[PDB]
């Protein structure tokens, strides 16, 4: 799944930054969040987030929802590696399993239950 952030920030610079930020704010997890191609819903203000390790995916839905001012009837789905993480994982667990060699975790969101329609 293409990411703009990866496209325009060189790996080794993503890696030094991710290492620093883990070392500097350890009880939070660094997350890149970008709208899925062809998602019809709101675009996000910023894309770099430092998230409490013990926040649930579920709870993170509410926070992101509120940041893009979704309509009640709008849907929101998350995608890590083309796959939905279950609401019942922590962001910390998601980070452990799914972070990349640059120390970031990458999440795309959509109004479709499939990336990326």
């Amino acid at each position: 799944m293409k990411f703009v952030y990866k496209e325009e920030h060189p790996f080794e610079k993503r890696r030094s930054e991710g290492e620093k930020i883990r070392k500097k704010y350890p009880d939070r997890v660094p997350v890149i969040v970008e709208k899925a191609p062809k998602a019809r819903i709101g675009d996000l203000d910023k894309k770099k987030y430092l998230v409490p390790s013990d926040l649930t995916v579920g709870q993170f839905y509410f926070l992101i929802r509120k940041r893009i001012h979704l309509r009640a009837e709008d849907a929101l789905f998350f995608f890590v590696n083309n796959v939905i993480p279950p609401t019942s994982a922590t962001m910390g667990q998601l980070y452990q399993e799914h972070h990349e060699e640059d120390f970031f975790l990458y999440i795309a969101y959509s109004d479709e239950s499939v990336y990326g329609l």
Binding site: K24, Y25, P30, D45, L50, P52, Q59
Partner: peptide
């Protein structure tokens, strides 16, 4: 809230 280029996401 926003330091080091990251939104410090709080429980809220």
């Amino acid at each position: 809230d926003e330091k080091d280029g990251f939104i410090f996401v709080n429980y809220s």
